[PDB]
Each structure stands twice: as C-alpha cells, then as structure tokens.
Design an enzyme around this catalytic site. Structure first.
Site, PDB file in Angstrom:
ATOM      1  N   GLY A 109       4.056   3.660  -0.936  1.00 13.70           N
ATOM      2  CA  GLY A 109       4.490   3.509   0.167  1.00 13.70           C
ATOM      3  C   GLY A 109       5.814   2.910   0.357  1.00 13.70           C
TER       4      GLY A 109
ATOM      5  N   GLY B  52       7.695   0.175   6.499  1.00 10.40           N
ATOM      6  CA  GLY B  52       8.708  -0.812   6.883  1.00 10.40           C
ATOM      7  C   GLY B  52       9.548  -2.235   6.082  1.00 10.40           C
ATOM      8  N   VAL B  53       8.129  -2.811   4.817  1.00 15.37           N
ATOM      9  CA  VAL B  53       8.342  -3.492   3.491  1.00 15.37           C
ATOM     10  C   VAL B  53       8.763  -2.232   2.291  1.00 15.37           C
ATOM     11  CG1 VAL B  53       7.178  -4.547   2.239  1.00 15.37           C
ATOM     12  CG2 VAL B  53       5.723  -4.588   5.235  1.00 15.37           C
ATOM     13  N   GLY B  54       8.217  -1.651   2.665  1.00 15.62           N
ATOM     14  CA  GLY B  54       8.396  -0.224   1.433  1.00 15.62           C
ATOM     15  C   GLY B  54      10.251  -0.033   1.024  1.00 15.62           C
TER      16      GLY B  54
ATOM     17  N   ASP C 128       2.838 -16.826   1.629  1.00 17.58           N
ATOM     18  CA  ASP C 128       2.652 -18.247   1.637  1.00 17.58           C
ATOM     19  C   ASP C 128       3.114 -18.904   0.927  1.00 17.58           C
ATOM     20  OD1 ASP C 128       1.140 -16.229   3.489  1.00 17.58           O
ATOM     21  OD2 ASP C 128      -0.916 -16.582   1.598  1.00 17.58           O
TER      22      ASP C 128
ATOM     23  N   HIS D  29      -5.055 -15.179   2.361  1.00 19.36           N
ATOM     24  CA  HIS D  29      -3.978 -14.308   3.049  1.00 19.36           C
ATOM     25  C   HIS D  29      -4.022 -14.540   3.785  1.00 19.36           C
ATOM     26  CE1 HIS D  29      -0.565 -13.201   2.067  1.00 19.36           C
ATOM     27  NE2 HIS D  29      -0.410 -12.118   2.570  1.00 19.36           N
TER      28      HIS D  29
HETATM   29  N1  LIG Z   1       0.926  -9.436   1.073  1.00 18.15           N
HETATM   30  C1  LIG Z   1       1.966  -9.215   2.657  1.00 18.15           C
HETATM   31  O1  LIG Z   1       1.411 -10.694   3.081  1.00 18.15           O
HETATM   32  C2  LIG Z   1       2.071  -8.369   3.797  1.00 18.15           C
HETATM   33  C3  LIG Z   1       3.247  -8.908   5.413  1.00 18.15           C
HETATM   34  C4  LIG Z   1       2.847  -8.059   5.590  1.00 18.15           C
HETATM   35  C5  LIG Z   1       3.118  -6.732   5.633  1.00 18.15           C
HETATM   36  N2  LIG Z   1       2.165  -6.731   4.697  1.00 18.15           N
HETATM   37  C6  LIG Z   1       1.855  -5.025   4.574  1.00 18.15           C
HETATM   38  O2  LIG Z   1       1.917  -4.108   3.705  1.00 18.15           O
HETATM   39  C7  LIG Z   1       1.745  -3.288   4.820  1.00 18.15           C
HETATM   40  C8  LIG Z   1       2.775  -2.030   4.439  1.00 18.15           C
HETATM   41  O3  LIG Z   1       3.196  -2.406   5.874  1.00 18.15           O
HETATM   42  P1  LIG Z   1       4.677  -2.533   6.597  1.00 18.15           P
HETATM   43  O4  LIG Z   1       5.573  -2.560   7.546  1.00 18.15           O
HETATM   44  O5  LIG Z   1       5.407  -1.670   5.732  1.00 18.15           O
HETATM   45  O6  LIG Z   1       3.785  -0.427   7.473  1.00 18.15           O
HETATM   46  P2  LIG Z   1       4.808   1.174   7.611  1.00 18.15           P
HETATM   47  O7  LIG Z   1       3.891   1.862   9.058  1.00 18.15           O
HETATM   48  O8  LIG Z   1       6.172   0.174   8.291  1.00 18.15           O
HETATM   49  O9  LIG Z   1       4.669   1.140   6.365  1.00 18.15           O
HETATM   50  C9  LIG Z   1       3.867   2.235   5.707  1.00 18.15           C
HETATM   51  C10 LIG Z   1       3.791   2.667   4.555  1.00 18.15           C
HETATM   52  O10 LIG Z   1       3.512   2.851   3.857  1.00 18.15           O
HETATM   53  C11 LIG Z   1       3.237   4.968   4.182  1.00 18.15           C
HETATM   54  N3  LIG Z   1       1.163   5.307   3.615  1.00 18.15           N
HETATM   55  C12 LIG Z   1       0.819   5.511   4.059  1.00 18.15           C
HETATM   56  N4  LIG Z   1      -0.173   5.974   3.313  1.00 18.15           N
HETATM   57  C13 LIG Z   1       0.245   6.409   2.044  1.00 18.15           C
HETATM   58  C14 LIG Z   1      -0.496   6.903   0.935  1.00 18.15           C
HETATM   59  N5  LIG Z   1      -1.403   7.171   0.472  1.00 18.15           N
HETATM   60  N6  LIG Z   1       0.595   6.591   0.042  1.00 18.15           N
HETATM   61  C15 LIG Z   1       2.069   6.736   0.158  1.00 18.15           C
HETATM   62  N7  LIG Z   1       1.871   6.305   1.250  1.00 18.15           N
HETATM   63  C16 LIG Z   1       1.881   6.070   2.191  1.00 18.15           C
HETATM   64  C17 LIG Z   1       3.528   5.214   4.530  1.00 18.15           C
HETATM   65  O11 LIG Z   1       3.633   6.482   5.197  1.00 18.15           O
HETATM   66  C18 LIG Z   1       4.844   4.275   5.653  1.00 18.15           C
HETATM   67  O12 LIG Z   1       6.045   4.545   5.039  1.00 18.15           O
HETATM   68  C19 LIG Z   1       0.718  -3.234   5.412  1.00 18.15           C
HETATM   69  O13 LIG Z   1      -0.754  -2.858   5.311  1.00 18.15           O
HETATM   70  C20 LIG Z   1       0.870  -4.246   6.213  1.00 18.15           C
HETATM   71  O14 LIG Z   1       0.022  -5.315   6.479  1.00 18.15           O
HETATM   72  C21 LIG Z   1       1.249  -7.121   3.935  1.00 18.15           C
END
Ligand SMILES: NC(=O)c1ccc[n+]([C@@H]2O[C@H](COP(=O)([O-])OP(=O)(O)OC[C@H]3O[C@@H](n4cnc5c(N)ncnc54)[C@H](O)[C@@H]3O)[C@@H](O)[C@H]2O)c1
Ligand SMILES: Nc1ncnc2c1ncn2[C@@H]1O[C@H](COP(=O)(O)OP(=O)(O)O)[C@@H](O)[C@H]1O
Ligand SMILES: [Cl-]
Ligand SMILES: [Cl-]
Lengths: 339, 339
Positions: B8, B12-14, B149, B187
């Site tokens: 991933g 956004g995070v990745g 957190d 969380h």
């Molecule tokens: N742990 C935490 O505290 C925390 C904080 C913020 C966000 N998040 C989570 O992080 C996740 C990602 O958020 P984001 O803002 O990066 O979303 P985003 O939509 O910007 O990015 C998500 C990425 O995942 C990819 N993806 C989807 N299915 C996939 C698969 N099968 N294999 C590989 N890649 C795949 C998409 O192509 C995309 O690039 C979400 O679940 C969000 O809820 C967690």
C-alpha cells in the site's frame, strides 16, 4: 528557533517537504500556505511530537503566514498535464513565483527565500528582478534550491561503483559522498555539471564516467519515465529541499553545514567572489550559477570558488556547454519581468 | 541490516511512510508494492542518498516484493471519506488485509507484520485468524500500529500544559514525553486510554485533564474535520508508523528502544504476561489490547504490564469502557474470517 513558511505546502513536493520540516529540531514555528488545503495539512502535522508549532493558512492569509518568517521555501508551481506544454508550465510557474515573492517582499522582506519550483534556472532570476523592482533584494537571501542534483550525484556515484568495482563500491557511504563530488551550474539537463573531486574515484569508474555524468544530468527524466510520463520527482525533491533548508537553519544556530561544498543557484554580481566566479566559468556577465556557498545567519555571505580552480579538462567542456544554455534560461526569466 | 516491504506504498500514508523508511539507517532494502504506481515511487525514492536499495513493484509482483522480507508494513486500505459508513470501511479494509496477509503467509511467513490499516481493533484479529488458518501464525510477529495515539498524547500533553501554565509547559520536550504518558487499549475513540504516569503533570493540567483525554481519543475526528471530510491523518500517521517501525528495526541490531513503554495492539494469549494483562484489564478472555511491548529480533517476546498495576480510579473507568467496546470490535474481526 527559526520561523519557516512554506508557500505551496499542499502540493506533491510541498506535503512531504512540510513533513520533513516539521521534524527539524532547528524550527520553532512552521507556517504552511497554499491556495487549497493547507489548514488541514497543518493540523495533521501539528499532531507530530516535535517542538515546533505548525499552522496552515487559507488562500487569503498569506500575510499571517509570512509575518516574521525568517526562511521561506517555495515549492509552489503547476504540475505537467495534457494541454500544458513546458512553455505553459514556465509561464504559469513564473506568474506564481512573481506573486509569491512579491508577497515576501511585502510581508517578510528580511526572509531567506529558497526557491524550489522549477525551472530554477529561469525562476530564480524572476524572483530577483521582482524584488529589485520593489527595492527589496538582498543577494545573500535568494537561493535556488539545486541540491537534488548533488543528492543524485552522491547516490549514482555509489551505484556505478557497485556495478563496476564492487569492493570499492561496498566501501562508500551514500550519505558522505559530498566529500567526493560537487555539482555546479544550472538545474536542468546539460546545465548540470557534476565534478568528481576525488580522482581515484574517477579512475574506479573507468568507462562508466560518462554514463554517470549523463545520469546526474538527466535524472529527472528517469522518474518521469518510471511514472509513465504522468509525474516527476516529488519525494526525493522534498528530501533534497529539506536537506538544503536544514543547512540554512543550522546557520542561524551557529553550526557548520554537514555538506562539504554545499551549492545553490545564486546571484553572482552581488556576492563576494562572484566576479572571480564569473571569470572562472568563462563568462564575464553571467549573473547566476550554482556554486559552493558560505552561510552566516541564513544568508549567503560568499561564494567558494575552489572547485572551479582545479577543474579537469573534460569538466571545462561541461562548463562551457552549461554556460551557453544557462545564459538563455537566465534571459528567459529576466525578460518575464523586464517587459 | 533489515529488508522491509511496504504494501500500500502509493497511498496517502504509504508514500510519506515510504519516504521516511528510505531515510532509516536500519534498512538494507526497501520494497514497495501497491495496486498502482509503486514502481515510480520506488524509483523516485531510489535517488535519495541513504544506503538502502529501494525498488517498487507492480500489482502482479507481490512475491518479488515479499521475498526475504523481515518486516512488512501494511498501510494499504481505504481511509475515511464522506459517503462511506464505518461498516463499509471495515468490510473494504477487511478484504484488503485478508488478501495481503495471505500473501505474507505464502511468500514471507517469517516476517514481522505491522498493520497500519484501520480499523486496527478488528483488522488485527483478521490478520491473526487468516494466518492461523494457514498454519503461519506467530504471536510475536503480528502487531497493530497504534503509535499515533502515543504521538498525539505526547504532543497534546505539552500543548495543554502550555495553556494551563507556561512555566511547566516550556520545560517540556515533546520528543521525550513518552517518559510521562503511555497510551493503551484500542485505536478508536473511547478504546483509547491515555495514562499520564507523572501525577504532578496531572496536577498541573487541573481541569484541562478531561479535555486532554478527549483530544487524544478523538484526534482522528479532528483531522477529518480540518480536512473537510477528505481523509484523516496521512503525514502524522506516516511519522508515527515510521517511528514504530524504527523501534522494531532497532531490535534486530541489539539496541535499546528510545521510546519508554512503546505500545502495540497484540494477541495476548500467545505472549508472555498476556494472561496477566487480561486479568489486569478485567476480562480473562479478551484476546487483544495495545500495551507496552518488549521486542527481540523484531518480535514481541513479552508484554510489560506495569502501567496497568497502578491505575487511577478514573483510568479504571476508561479501561472498563474500552474493554466493552474492544470485545465487540475483536469479535467483528474474527467473524469476518470464521464466518
Ligand atoms: N494506524 C493508524 O493510526 C491510521 C491513521 C490514519 C490512517 N490509517 C489507515 O491507513 C489506511 C490507508 O489510508 P490512506 O489515507 O493511505 O488511503 P489512500 O486511499 O490514500 O491509500 C491507500 C492505498 O492502499 C492501496 N491499496 C488498496 N488495496 C490494496 C491491495 N490489495 N494491495 C496493495 N495496495 C492496496 C491503494 O492503491 C492506495 O494506494 C486506511 O486504512 C486508513 O484508515 C491508519
Ligand atoms: N499562487 C500560489 N500560491 C500558493 N500555492 C500555489 C499557488 N499556485 C499553485 N499553488 C500550489 O502549489 C502546489 C503545487 O503542487 P503539485 O501541483 O502537486 O506539483 P509539484 O509539487 O510536484 O510541483 C499545489 O498545492 C498548488 O495548489
Ligand atoms: Cl521581515
Ligand atoms: Cl520468510
């Protein structure tokens, strides 16, 4: 305890740039600005547990953004898309830079302005002429950020040594390669001039020497190509930008830079040893060049011309090709303002 | 040095997570994978002059991504966005996490799996039950990254002391506040339990204490609103995920963690002191909780239950509210796999 403003903070380069800036221990306040979304980005960064307050500002609050900013980073710009040529890109980016730099001259005229947007070669002259019209130009305070060329040179030098002489390659640390290479000139293609200052490494590269030079020069294309023609270096550009910004911030804190022969694209006629450097690059009226700089309190106080003294014969030929093209890029920027 | 894979990486995070991992001195190879665009981001990153090799992989090449990976970060997922319910998000992320964790089980079954995908509370159980079906579940190797957190609690403790009394506020370093606050539980919202372990800071907060607790618990919501609905934390989550990963990477190299009482969401019955943890939170069958962990060679080898030994009365109430909600979230995760 430096206040830093980022103008264009919501963009592809600006977001990761703002993140790296938030992590700097040399920053006390970080203010982010953009025509869209900067308040939310600010808020997200403000959660990070480093000792800097971070606030983002809406499109109408550039004055609050800039007030008392010591350093202003400008990665603002428009990204490539269908129907936008490189000349469109230039003209819209030149309008953005003109407008942002005018705002600096109004709201934080003492700021060190670090221009990250491309093309640097032309946009830095735009910034300088914009400020001159305003009576707000200080040569030591306008720097084109060319550091990504050095970062690439340090990385590719080691990659080519791995490929060519694994034992020597294995010996190198990519993070300290600035001790062995310096990049001067402009920020695009054949304006870029990588100077390997350790001749043993030139020896070790053997027939890869020209491939190395080509790869640093056309590094940006390698990414544009890896991204199917849809985008360019964002993350590495934000990295190089933050690394240069950190060197600037360390100089407010009475610390020597970590980079040997740290270079930036600067206004030669207004800076000590600038005349000598015009002489050494073989063009007596060339107004801009990226060269090693000495910082004091965030401002460029002189140019270090050492690297240009000791140039190899082949390096001399790179310098001549660069200068020819750089003169035209400079004039394209100048004439955006002067007409 | 350590091979890290990110599944991933283009999100956004990745993306910023990938950038921060590229900068780590503990990483030898960084492999990036996504359904789109990872090759191009990997290539961008590969120009950065830190010693890791960085390669991105296309959607059909997860095997090559995972091959001999020691640590796998999964920021893959669908983030919060208007028009998506809590249940829609769970179902979409559940399938993504099931599929990616399957691929870890098949191609890198010895990897430490750090789940960043939300909702952590339900998705970590899905990862575990998925691995269990394959015979590839190791308890010390599956961690929910809850570290944002703690990052928020360290930041917000300083911000609230700075309002309540600047004199003590100013003596605080945000970067070392983990000495004074530990966050446990889950969380999401009221699963999140911030424990100020220094009673004199509790005193100084006075009637900001409840405001502090609430802000830590609802930090996610605060960013969604600041971004007008457009996702939650991206950059701060990348920062928090990188910080946590770094503690994991550091443990391979036999080095003490820099974060006191570092917590992650772990499977209690498979870990030393997990039974004791269950008794302390008042539910002898609760299978997951975020508590301070001891790492050895990237694996959780025990849980440190100290923080649970001397909970305030009011902390006790937070723990009881959290455990009720946790039990439901966990059972929702498990039923996804167990049908
Ligand atoms: N742990 C935490 O505290 C925390 C904080 C913020 C966000 N998040 C989570 O992080 C996740 C990602 O958020 P984001 O803002 O990066 O979303 P985003 O939509 O910007 O990015 C998500 C990425 O995942 C990819 N993806 C989807 N299915 C996939 C698969 N099968 N294999 C590989 N890649 C795949 C998409 O192509 C995309 O690039 C979400 O679940 C969000 O809820 C967690
Ligand atoms: N006059 C302006 N002032 C501030 N920001 C601007 C201005 N014009 C454009 N921008 C911003 O600059 C940023 C450029 O980012 P983007 O288009 O993603 O490309 P990149 O960072 O790769 O050049 C955008 O967030 C855009 O809104
Ligand atoms: Cl000023
Ligand atoms: Cl394995």
């Amino acid at each position: 305890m430096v206040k830093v403003a980022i103008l264009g903070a919501s963009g592809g380069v600006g977001q990761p740039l703002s993140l790296l800036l938030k992590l700097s221990p040399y920053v006390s306040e970080l203010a982010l600005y953009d025509i869209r979304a900067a308040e939310g980005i600010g808020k997200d960064l403000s959660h990070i547990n480093t000792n800097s307050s971070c606030v983002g500002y809406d499109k109408d609050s550039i004055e609050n953004t800039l007030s008392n900013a010591q350093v202003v980073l400008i990665p603002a710009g428009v990204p490539r898309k269908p129907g936008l040529t490189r000349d469109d890109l230039f003209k819209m980016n030149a309008g953005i830079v003109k407008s942002l730099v005018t705002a600096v001259g109004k709201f934080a005229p003492n700021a060190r302005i670090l221009v990250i947007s491309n093309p640097v070669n032309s946009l830095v002259p735009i910034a300088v002429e914009t400020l001159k019209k305003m009576g707000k130009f200080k040569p030591g305070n306008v720097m084109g950020v060319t550091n990504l060329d050095l970062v690439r040179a340090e990385t590719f030098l080691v990659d080519y040594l791995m490929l060519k002489n694994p034992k020597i390659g294995q010996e190198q640390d990519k993070t300290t390669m600035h001790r062995k290479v310096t990049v001067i000139g402009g920020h695009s293609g054949e304006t870029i001039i990588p100077i390997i200052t350790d001749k043993s490494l030139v020896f070790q590269l053997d027939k890869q020497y020209e491939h190395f030079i080509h790869r640093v020069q056309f590094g940006g294309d390698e990414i544009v190509k890896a991204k199917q023609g849809a985008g360019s270096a964002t993350l590495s550009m934000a990295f190089a930008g933050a690394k240069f910004a950190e060197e600037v911030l360390r100089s407010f804190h009475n610390e020597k830079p970590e980079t040997e022969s740290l270079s930036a694209f600067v206004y030669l006629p207004g800076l000590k040893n600038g005349k000598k450097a015009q002489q050494l690059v073989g063009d007596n009226s060339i107004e801009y060049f990226s060269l090693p700089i000495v910082l004091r309190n965030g401002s460029v106080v002189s140019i270090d011309t050492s690297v240009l003294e000791k140039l190899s014969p082949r390096e001399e030929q790179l310098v001549n090709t660069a200068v020819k093209e750089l003169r035209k890029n400079i004039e394209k920027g100048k004439s955006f303002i002067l007409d």
